[PDB]
RNA sequence: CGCUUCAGCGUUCUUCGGAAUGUCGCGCAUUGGCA
């Protein structure tokens, strides 16, 4: 599937999600199809845990991490090599931030539709709210809180946060979105 | 038999241009980088 992602996003990228109409035509056909995937996978999973009624009933997890000491760690050039190393350090630094995504989610058993955005040193995903997912999320935070440790003594650190969101909330309604 | 008046006067007193220019405006070695 994920050739198959990366094959929708080369495409579907100018082709509008919504033609003529009135509203502003302001998503992509891969951004709507990529939504509707990360959110179909997030139901499906909900309904495995076991419509106007759908939407209020909390569907959905809201899960972001975030790098701690990302800038200080680029600078921690001795100098006598910093051209090589300042351009390396930041790689792996955004590297590693992919790793991370992608071992999380193959443990939830999730394309990367989930993963809404990435920020330099910081991810956003969508999840589903079923209580494997967030048991998911206890193993790989403290799976990764200790693999720092072990790698760098508190020179880097990552944490996890989860929000349960409705559906009405995905779709900004009565603004919860922002 | 000389005597006297006059003893210099009026008028230009410097002028017109150039007023600096061209050249260099830190270099090297160490630091860096690359191997």
Same mark, same amino acid.
């Given at each position: 599937?994920?050739?198959?992602?990366?094959?929708?996003?080369?495409?579907?990228?100018?082709?509008?999600?919504?033609?003529?109409?009135?509203?502003?035509?302001? @998503?992509?056909?891969?951004? #709507?199809?990529?939504?509707?995937?990360?959110? %179909?996978?997030?139901?499906?999973? *909900?309904?495995? =845990?076991?419509?106007?009624?759908?939407?209020?009933? !909390?569907?959905?997890?809201? @899960?972001?991490?975030?790098?701690?000491?990302?800038? !200080?760690?680029?600078?921690?050039?001795?100098?006598?090599?910093?051209?090589?190393?300042?351009?390396?350090?930041?790689?792996?630094?955004?590297?590693?931030?992919?790793?991370?995504?992608?071992?999380?989610?193959?443990?939830?058993?999730?394309?990367?539709?989930?993963?809404?955005?990435?920020?330099?040193? #910081? %991810? *956003?995903?969508?999840?589903?709210?079923?209580?494997?997912?967030? !048991?998911?999320?206890?193993?790989? =935070?403290?799976?990764?809180? =200790?693999?720092?440790?072990?790698?760098?003594?508190? !020179?880097?650190? @990552? %944490?996890?946060? *989860?929000? %349960?969101? $409705?559906? =009405?909330?995905?779709?900004?309604?009565?603004? $919860?979105?922002?």
């Amino acid at each position: 599937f994920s050739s198959l992602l990366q094959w929708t996003e080369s495409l579907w990228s100018y082709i509008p999600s919504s033609t003529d109409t009135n509203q502003v035509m302001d @998503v992509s056909l891969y951004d #709507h199809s990529k939504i509707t995937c990360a959110i %179909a996978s997030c139901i499906y999973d *909900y309904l495995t =845990e076991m419509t106007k009624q759908f939407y209020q009933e !909390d569907v959905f997890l809201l @899960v972001s991490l975030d790098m701690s000491g990302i800038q !200080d760690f680029i600078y921690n050039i001795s100098g006598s090599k910093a051209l090589k190393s300042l351009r390396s350090r930041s790689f792996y630094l955004e590297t590693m931030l992919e790793s991370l995504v992608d071992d999380l989610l193959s443990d939830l058993e999730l394309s990367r539709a989930n993963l809404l955005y990435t920020g330099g040193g #910081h %991810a *956003y995903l969508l999840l589903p709210n079923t209580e494997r997912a967030r !048991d998911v999320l206890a193993s790989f =935070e403290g799976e990764m809180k =200790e693999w720092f440790i072990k790698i760098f003594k508190t !020179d880097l650190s @990552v %944490a996890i946060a *989860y929000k %349960a969101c $409705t559906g =009405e909330d995905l779709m900004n309604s009565n603004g $919860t979105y922002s």
